[PDB]
Structure formats: C-alpha cells, structure tokens
Amino acid sequence: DDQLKQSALDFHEFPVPGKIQVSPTKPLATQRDLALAYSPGVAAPCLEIEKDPLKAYKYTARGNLVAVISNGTAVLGLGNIGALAGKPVMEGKGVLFKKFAGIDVFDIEVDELDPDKFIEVVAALEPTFGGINLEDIKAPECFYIEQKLRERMNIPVFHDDQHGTAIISTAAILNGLRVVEKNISDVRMVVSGAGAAAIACMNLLVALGLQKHNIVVCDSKGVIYQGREPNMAETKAAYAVVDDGKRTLDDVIEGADIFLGCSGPKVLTQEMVKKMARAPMILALANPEPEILPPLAKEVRPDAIICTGRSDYPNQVNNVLCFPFIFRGALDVGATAINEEMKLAAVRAIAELAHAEQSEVVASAYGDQDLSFGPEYIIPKPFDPRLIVKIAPAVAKAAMESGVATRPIADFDVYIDKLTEFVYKTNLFMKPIFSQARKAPKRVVLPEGEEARVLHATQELVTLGLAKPILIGRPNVIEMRIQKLGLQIKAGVDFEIVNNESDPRFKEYWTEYFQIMKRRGVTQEQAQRALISNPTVIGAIMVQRGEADAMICGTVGDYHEHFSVVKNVFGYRDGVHTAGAMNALLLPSGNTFIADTYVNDEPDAEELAEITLMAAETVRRFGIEPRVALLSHSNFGSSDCPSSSKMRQALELVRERAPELMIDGEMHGDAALVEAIRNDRMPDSSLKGSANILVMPNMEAARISYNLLRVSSSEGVTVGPVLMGVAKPVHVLTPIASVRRIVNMVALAVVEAQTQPL
Amino acid sequence: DDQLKQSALDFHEFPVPGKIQVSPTKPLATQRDLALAYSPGVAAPCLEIEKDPLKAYKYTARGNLVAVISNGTAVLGLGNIGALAGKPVMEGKGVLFKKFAGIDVFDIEVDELDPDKFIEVVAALEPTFGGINLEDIKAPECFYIEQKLRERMNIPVFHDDQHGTAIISTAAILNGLRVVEKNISDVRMVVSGAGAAAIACMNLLVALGLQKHNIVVCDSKGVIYQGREPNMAETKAAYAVVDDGKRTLDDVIEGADIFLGCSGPKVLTQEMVKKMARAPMILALANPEPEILPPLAKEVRPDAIICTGRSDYPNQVNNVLCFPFIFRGALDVGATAINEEMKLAAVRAIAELAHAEQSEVVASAYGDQDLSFGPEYIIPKPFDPRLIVKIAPAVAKAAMESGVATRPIADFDVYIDKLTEFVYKTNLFMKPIFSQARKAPKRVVLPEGEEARVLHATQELVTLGLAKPILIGRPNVIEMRIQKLGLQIKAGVDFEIVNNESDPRFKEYWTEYFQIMKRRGVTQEQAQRALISNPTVIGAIMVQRGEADAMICGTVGDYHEHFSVVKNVFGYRDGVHTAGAMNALLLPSGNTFIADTYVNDEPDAEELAEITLMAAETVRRFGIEPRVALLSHSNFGSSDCPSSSKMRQALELVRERAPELMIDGEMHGDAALVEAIRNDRMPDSSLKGSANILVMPNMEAARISYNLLRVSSSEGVTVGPVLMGVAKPVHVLTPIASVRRIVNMVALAVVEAQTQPL
C-alpha cells in the first residue's frame, strides 16, 4: 500500500514542523509594532480586558480560536495512542478547520487520561479558548467526560462527533423522510453498534418530534431492549421496546424505516433489507466497510436511500460539513454553550441545502456536478461554497432563538455579505477537475518521458487514473530511470512508450510535419531530423493525427521553443488570432490569474482583448466568476503613455465583445486587489470586490509580478501556465515545474480533451 | 497621558482579533493538501509519533513552540488580573517572541490560581508544548510553583524572569567586574527589595564562583541577615552575615561592590554611594524610577557603572536580550530542562558581546551607533543581529556540556549559517533612523498642511520630537481641522505655519522661482501665481533658500506634478544625472527594495546603472548589505529583447563603477529571491542568498510588482518612495500614504538633512 502508505508517510513537514504556525497576523517589522505587541502598548488591551471580561474575544484569539482539546484516547479513528503521540492526526483534524472555514486550532493535548482529572485540566485551560472542540475522548468516557464538561465553562463547550455528526445525520434523516414522502411520527429505526458517535445520535434524532418507543438500540451483544438484561442499560431503556422473544437481529426489522448507525463491521444483510418496509432507508455510516455493500443491496432492491460517510459516493458526512461551520456559528455568535436548538436548526440548513442546491457558478466545463435531489442525493457533498453561509447562520440564529449568546449578530445582510466574501477567497476548483478527468481518462503525450519529474507525475497519474500516459523517449533509459527512482509503473501495462528513434510510424510522421512546414523553412531532411531529435514535434504530430488527445511539454528547454512547434502544428482556435498563457496564484484575496505571462511580449489592444476574453472564459470554466482588472502604472487615466492608452482601448474592445463580463481599468495592482482603494478612487467602478484576473500591459511586467508573488505571496500550486487560443489541448510548462504542477496540468488537459479537443 | 494612553489604547486588533493568528504555514488550497492535513494522510505523522515519541518536535509545533503558560498573577508588571483577563499583556509578551526570534507562542492561560493545582494543570498541558515559558506566576508562589514544576516534565521547563534576567544580570556583572579590573572573589553586594525577579538573581550570581558570605540580602523590612529575625528566612540565610548592629541600610555599605536589585522604588542615596568603595558598580534595575537617578549620582561621583533595565540608556535588560534566544538555545537543542550551565554559558555570550561588538553592517549614515565598551557600555543594546547567533548557540553548547539534550546540534558551522540566514530576513533599520533623527531635529516643510493625515503625522512628529514641522496652508482651515481632529498641537508652540497667501516673503519667493524658471516657460505672473497656489513650489523655495532643511510632499496630486517642481528647483545631485524612487517591502525573504517605481518610465543602461548605485548606497545607509538583482522576463540571456540587453549593459556598467557591490542579472524574480533556483540556474552567481534590491526594466513592471506585493505579500510600512538623485532632501509621497508612512519618511528626511542637505 506504499502508493498510499509511503505517499502519506511523505508528510508536508519538511520546510517547517507542524501544519499550524503560530504567527503574527499583524505586522511586526518595526520597533513601533514590537513595542505595541510586547512593550507598554500591549498593557492597554490586557488592562481593558481585565476591566470588563467582555473584551476577551475581541483583542485576542478565543474569538475564532477553538482548541481541539484531547487526551488522545480516540484519535479520529486511531484510538488511545496518547496526547502528545496523537499529534499527527490531531494536526490533521485541526488543519481541516482553518482550511475550510478559517478556524484557529491550538492543538493543546491534555496528558491527563483519567475521566475525572481530564475535565479538571480542560476547565483549567478554559480561559485560553473561546470554545473547546473536545475530540479523541474515547468511549464510554467520551459521554461521561462531555457531560461533566458541558456544565462548567461559560463558553461554547461543544464536543466532537459525540455532539458532532448528529447535525448532519438528523439533517439526512429530515431529507430522507422527505424523499419517501413519510413522516417522523410513524418511522421505525434500527441502530447497531452503539459506539462513541452512534449511541448519542438518536438522542438528537428524537428531538425532531420523534417518539422514543420507535427506536431500537443494539450493540455487539444482540439487541438492547427492555427485558433483555435484568439491569437496564442507561440512555437506552427509554427507547427499549417490550420483550417479545426477538433475540436475533435478522427478525427485529419487522418493516422498520431507518438504520442510523455509526459503528464498525457489517451487521445488516440483504434478506434483512427485504424484511424492511416499503422504501427502505438504510443509513450505513461505517467508514472502513459499508454495512450493506450499497451496490449489492441496490441490485437486490431498487429505490434505496443508502447513506454513507465516505466521499466516494454522494451524501457524505464529514466534519467539514458543519463542525468548522458550527463553531463559525457557535464562536461567531458569542454563545456560552451549544444547546439542542443549535444542534437542530443547523439540521434545517444542510437538509434544506440538498433540495435547494443550484447555480453558485457551476463550472461551465470541467467539474461535471450533475447534482439533483433524489434517492441518490440526501445531503450536500462534503465541500460547498454555501455549506458555510447556510449552516453557520443557522447555528447563530438558533443561538439567538435559545437566548444563550453574548454577541448577537446584527442584521444578517452584513453577516451574509462577509461570509460570502470569505467564500470567494477560498476555492478548490482543482478537485472537480480531478473528479471529471478520472471518470474519462484520455491519452496524453509527455514528450519529456525520461525526466524524473515527468516519471513521478506519470506514476501519480496512473495511480489516480487521471490519464493514459504516452511517454516519448528511449525505452532503455526510461526503464533504468524508473527502476532507480523506485516507481511501480511498467511499459505497456500502465503507460505507452513511443521511441523517438526506430518509431514504426516515422515515415508517416515526418511526412505530415513536412507537409505542414514545407513552405515555412523546413525541408524533408529537416523534417526527418525533427521527428527523431525533437520530442515536442513527435507529440504534436501524434495529437494532430489523433493517436493522442493532449500534450504536456515544456519541462525542458525554452517556452517558445515548444510553443512555436505547438502553434505551427495545431494553429490557432477558430475565431481566435492570438494565444496567451495564464498563471494561477493563491493570494490572500483568493485565486488570482495573471494573463499572458509567456506568449506575447508586447500585445496590442486587440490581442489584449482576445487574451482577456479567453482568460475570462477559462476562469469561468474553473467555476470561478471572472472579475477582470487591466493593470497599468496609471490609475484611471493618470498617465498618457501608449501602454495605458492600449489598456483603455482593450477595455473598450472587451466591453464591446462581452457586455456581461465584470471588468474595469486601467488601474493599479492595489486598486484591483483591495476594494477600499478602488472605491476611494472610482466609486462607480464596474469591478466588485477583488479582481481574480489580472491582465498586464507587457510580458515583462506579468512575468516579474508572477515570479515575485509566487515565491513571496502564494500558498500552493494549482495550474499554470494555462495555454489559451491553440486549436488542440496542449500546455507548455516550465523546466522548474514540480510533479504536482505536471499532474494538475495533465488533469486539466485531459478534461479539456473531453470537450472536443479541437 | 492620552498621547500614550489613547495611542496605546488604539491597539492593532481591528483587522483580525489577536496578534497571533494560528494559520497553516503549509499550503491548504487544494483537496490534496486538505486530505494530507485532516484526512487519511495526516494519520501517518500521528502514527509515526506514537510509534516512537522521538518525532514529537519534528512533525508538529512543540519544536519552536513555547507556551507562556500563566495564571495571570503577575502579568509582566501588572499583577493578578487573571488568566483570561491577562490576555492583552499576555499577547504583548508573546509577540516579542516571534517578532525577534520567531518563537511560536500559544497564549494558553491556566485559570487555576492555587499554588498546587496550577502545577497540576500545567503538567496536564505539558505534551502540547516543547518548553513552557512560565510567566505571570506571582511571588512568593512563583518560586514555589517553578520549583515544583521543574521536576515533572521531561521537556525544557524554563520559567520567565525568575530564571530570566539572571543570564543578562550575571553577564552584566561579569562585564562590570571586567570594567573596574576587579575579581569575583572579593566583591561585596547589596540587594534591596527581594521580589519575584530579585531574590532569585544572586543565586545565579553566586554560580560564577562567588562566595555566599559576600551577599547581603534586604527587603522592605530592613536587612535580611542572620541574627535579625529569630526565624531565619529561607534561601537568604546562606548569604546572611553575622549580627553586627547594622540596622539601617545607609551604613551596611561599608565599601560594597555591587547593587544587584530588581525591585520597586528607590532605596539608595548619594551618601550611600559615597560610602561605597572605589569604583562603585550600582546596578539599579527598577523600571518605573531608577533607584539612584543616574544623572544625579554621576554628578556626585564619576566613573559610575550604573546599569538599568530601561532602553532610554545603554545596557538595557529586556527579555528579547536572551529569553527568545534562550529557547532558541533550549528548544532548538532538544534539552529536557534548563540547568544552571544553560543559565551560565549564556552569561558568557552576551557579556562577551559587549566588549566584542564590531562591524555587522553599521549604518553608513543614519543610526549613530557609537558603541564602545566602557563605563557606559556593559551589555549589548536590547536589539542586535547577533544577540541571537551568540546567545542561542551558547545555550545549546551549555546543553551538550550538561548532557541533558535529546537532539544535539551537529557541526556549528551549519547552525551559525542558518541562524545568520534567519538574521538577514528580520531587520529593523527604522529604529536607528528614529533615534538619530530625535537627537537632532530639523525643519521639514509639509506643503499639504491642511490634510488630516499630514496633521496626524505632525502630531506624531511633535510628540516623538523627530522634526520641527513647517506646515503650509490657510491658518484658519488648519486650526479648525486640528480642533475637529482632536489633536493637541498649536501654531508656533509646536509647528510653524506658512500661509500660502499673504506670506511676508512672497516678493522674495516668486522672484527666486522666476529666476530659476524664467527660461523654462514660467513668466513673472506665473511665478507669482505659483507661489500662492502651488504649496510644493513654496516648500521647495523655502528649502532651497535655507529656511527649511527638508520637504515631504506628494500626499495630493500626481507624483510627477511634485517631482517636476523638485527637480526644477533643487536639480540633480553632483555626479548624478538621473533620479529614482525606491520602495521598501517586508517580504518573507526580508526587507526588499524596488528601484525606480515612480520617476523614469523607461530608463536606459546608464540610468539603470545610476539608479542601481544610488539604491545600493541608500540601502547601505540603512544598515543592510546591498544584494542587487536586475530583473527581467529572461533568465540569464534567455531572451534577446532590447530590455534584457539593456539590463545586461546596466550590469556591466555597475560592475565597472562598483566592483565591491554584490549584484547579478538579469534573472527572474524567483531566481533573485530564492537561492536554490539561482544555484540550479547559475551555480557561480555573484549574488548570495536573497536579493534585497530589485531593479526593474521599466516603471510599469516595477510599479505593478510593488503594488501587487504590497497588498498581497507584505507585513508593514517602513519607507517609500525614497527619492534618490536630487540635490536637497525631499521625498514625494503618494496620495494614499498613511500617517505611519509620512512619519517614517519625515524622519528619514530629517536624518538625511543631518548629512549635508545638498
């Protein structure tokens, strides 16, 4: 399992230990700032906090900061490895808190494992945190410890999964009963494996208006019903049905309606599902192996409402569904705790979303969302731009309804505006591209097949099933390099090799190249020499003929050495007379794209307009709404240089061609990126918020800005340089492109070849 | 005290609460990265940690992370305000940990104030932190609590000041005994006010090889000596001298040699100092009021060795002296605790530094270091580029000598290299400029005297005593704007006003302007109209005549509208035929300067060489070693455009003019900023490390890059645009310049006017 075991063992800790880096969000680059932070000047915020404790969440963390406080006794799915020893998956849980909702997580881990001193230590560390994210407290001391801890602090004491997925689970129940046009009054339930996140879930499920006598709790030891054991089990006898001689699970169905269970191995069978009433609602939430094998049961019976917790299938129950967003409702409302109305109004938001999901800048191409409410869609997919702006305000609204909050939110229009603004700056458009490429792999030429980076990328693409690689190079050198690198790919089995020499199609290749380039300075002998010594020409001829769907070159040599071949063979797209390369950056303002960093040295107004339109179309296909800003050293007519006049001409041309495109210019970079500066300068600007597409006057400015920002102000690699305006799918990369860049660009080329590769 | 009370009450929390922002130091902008951080992929680091606890500091925080763990019982100098209520000055102490040494600080605050349960909670939270920074534990439970806590954890349990300043204090003692050519064997001591950081200091002071009988401990209740109280005070009777009838402090001197004391109000007098032996060594460390009033005692007796803890005078004892750097020695060595050899070898480093301080890129101009070892120099100044690379390796070396560490450092050449690399990226060149301007204020014209920003900057400059402002505007409008803004400045009292109309020197001003511009298109009537409607012309004529020393314009209008006036009046500098504007950025690689962002639209090779030389000279004057890199879209001859050829010509010209300047090009921005890319491309490059001066081919590229980086990748404002090549000190700013920018630029102009303002 080294393709996952070793790959995950290769953990991103190498630059600086720990995914979290406690760092100043404020400037600390001047003695004034340092004195404001540790010298007289920092005594004032502390004194103001001491005067009235109302200022605790304001001047410090503890506003956005949760602490996933743990004794390391059930580390996600690991168990009792320890507080300090739990740090890997501790940080793994804490990193999908900031990543998806911007939750600060102090990964402080309580070393006290006793079920009564652990609470003492946690309550001791209460003032550090504005809401604890109690996780890895194991069963049965999870319920005991959480019950003890809820009653002490005056700040949101919200456990993990124990409170947890009940919101997602009960939302899924509310939607599933909607699917089969049933009612909560008469629904019957079957629960198996009363574990940490299982036995506490029906308690919420009851809160919807559910009678206790309809729930049948079970564990490893048969069925937990009143009459089975002389000593009635706590928190389970309320639901416990009268004794009726039902000792086996295969008969206790009697036409039930729900299978809410968060446990381990399988307990349900196909005949068990058959004994269920009409329209079964199996909800097997087991992560290792689904308790019903959904394909088998669906072949046994149709119209299934099977719900799981794995992302391979729709209706996935992750923590990111509401946990970061619960605290985005819990901490951002000022609550002193989380009630059951908190836990139930957020049920009415994510359940509402599944049958009220639409628009939200669907990826015009790529992605392949194809999400409609029904038997295969009960709750939204794990990651959603409004999984926040619907669930977090639900929790806050429940906070004010419960009257337990200390900082009630004002008019929700402003709250929704800020939440959506935060939404724009965090997008993961590459995951839909990977998903869409995986369901229809195409043949991609990699002309630099002997490169170590290209070989690693080939291994990754074979593993993820994104493409059918076609390497170009000497098979001997490729094989020895593969063996030395340690890869598990083989010729023919995983990737096709095209030998640059002794190619059986040599005659038909150089002939086509000559017929393309006979009147462009290439003789027949030069064509023959190019189809043996220029792998880019071989790949381009392969793609043009039809033996491959896309090409990914550029990892060797200069950009234009490959782009000239690409343009000569494929040509320009229909209705397009220019090409441009778009580079993506993850700035603090969000995903930003810089247009024509590589192709045109000094584009003119018409070329700039074409590049702007192509960049907007490409960014639209990513699922991001294009917000273009033409950049210059002049701010809205400040200078009369030919460059600024060219930018204004391009703006007019773009407005002519695409009246619906949000674009403005020419302006400065800060005016484009921050809205306050632009509003001060141009209050009537057609550009709203931060611009995500930056069109530059010349290639020098674009390249210098991108190179400086990538090493200074950038998080990770997504795509770039995305070549636009060529007839066939091909992306010329750079010699310093990483393996991740190559894999992402190959996936993008595969998805573009799924859309008429011409 | 509102100029400090309100100003410090205006705390930098407005954008995001809390100086610390627990944020991913790793990219989290892709589903791959999110799964690596919270999904299967983060289970691997945690499992590897659990397998062997040796991986705790490696995959997470707890390597660089201290937690200043507190019950909020003595918050720096505040007291027992509370754990959560101590958050302001808690974060103030935690912010001068990351700011000066890059120490992560989890500001977790223990709510348990009992002297025996506090330790229980702290030991419970031990696995979260790789070394605790116990602070705000009050006396006498500070000593008790620290003594209890030292013996439990197997990770560095290093208290604050209690262990603390002993390193700096005993280093100061070691240097002071060097100053007066005495020996530790026969030195006598007087201690007053045995407080939290006082009674624990002589314990280290003994460890140098000091006899216990030479120390005389005292408190508020007279003198703590053996025979005074029937019950002998603990930790003080070892030093306690035999009873001799000495009941008053004014006589217990008998020619002593040290006054080590960390207490409150004054106890020592002038006749007390006279009773001291030859060459007194008073070391009054009281922060509110010095215990001796050093000027008065120095007038009473010469050759004083007075040492205080305030930064207004040399030999300041701050936490930044060694505390962040102790943990930079403690945590970065893998120790399980801090011994007394840790606490004593770091005494031999900072004490060594004071008499071994030299070079280290002294600010060629500005700054005014003027630091020589002697009676007024015992220990280095609070902030020093090698206060780290000498003290932290001292603590690590003491760790290996004590044999208590778990990750001993390899060959110290690599350690010193990394430490110096970290040193380059954190510089505070503006503090020396502020210090040098304050000791010689000059007259600075502010032609836009009616601007709210300029008025705020004028208030700041009057308060700090950096300049003698000369505002230009209507006195009526200026006064009403001052009253509305709430400032406490008055005309004549604090700043001079020059009325643009009805100026008594109108005739002599427009006459000089006409004589300058008579053959440049300006008539006598146009000169008269300019000296009434153009404040920049008035300020420039003022500076040229000699009635003012510097000008700071540009807060209104276009840059070149002011630069044309500046160039026409003052002209170019001697031997200089071009001007350029340098803008400063605080990048992750350090302070970076971009050359000619405002003046020359398309400079040629000679202009580029002149701009490069002027920028290097200016950066040298800041105290930073210039590392220039000429930027282009071509990487070392990749492209043959006229721009890249011009950059290469400029490189050759610069190498001719300044053979000692470290410069290379032309290259890409990433090649300039990160050394790995450059070494891959040009292994023999003359540029080492990251380039701090970036010279751009044209003004469009420079301006776009600076504008994008300032809003994306930048911490704070220092200076910019710094105008170079004009005869007299003047800086044209931008209309969006903040008050801090104006104050910094005025201070820079003041310091430049101290250096022959012509």
Ligand SMILES: NC(=O)c1ccc[n+]([C@@H]2O[C@H](COP(=O)([O-])OP(=O)(O)OC[C@H]3O[C@@H](n4cnc5c(N)ncnc54)[C@H](OP(=O)(O)O)[C@@H]3O)[C@@H](O)[C@H]2O)c1
């Ligand atoms: N959101 C998610 O996707 C998510 C979140 C959390 C957990 N989970 C899944 O839930 C399970 C454990 O999570 P947890 O920590 O909440 O619970 P847990 O504390 O691990 O307990 C699991 C329970 O399952 C029962 N069990 C074990 N083997 C069984 C068998 N052969 N037949 C019947 N019952 C059996 C045990 O009950 P007895 O003590 O009576 O044996 C045990 O208490 C794992 O499968 C995990 O992947 C999924």
Ligand SMILES: NC(=O)c1ccc[n+]([C@@H]2O[C@H](COP(=O)([O-])OP(=O)(O)OC[C@H]3O[C@@H](n4cnc5c(N)ncnc54)[C@H](OP(=O)(O)O)[C@@H]3O)[C@@H](O)[C@H]2O)c1
């Ligand atoms: N690095 C620095 O610059 C630095 C660091 C820490 C502290 N300090 C200074 O040290 C002082 C307190 O710091 P701390 O927390 O370490 O100590 P602390 O716990 O505040 O105790 C101060 C001690 O001074 C004594 N005292 C008070 N008034 C006195 C008087 N009139 N005459 C004689 N003794 C008197 C008291 O002793 P009794 O209990 O016997 O009255 C008290 O225990 C402040 O002045 C503070 O600024 C400076």
Ligand SMILES: [Mg+2]
């Ligand atoms: Mg967990």
Ligand SMILES: [Mg+2]
């Ligand atoms: Mg303190």
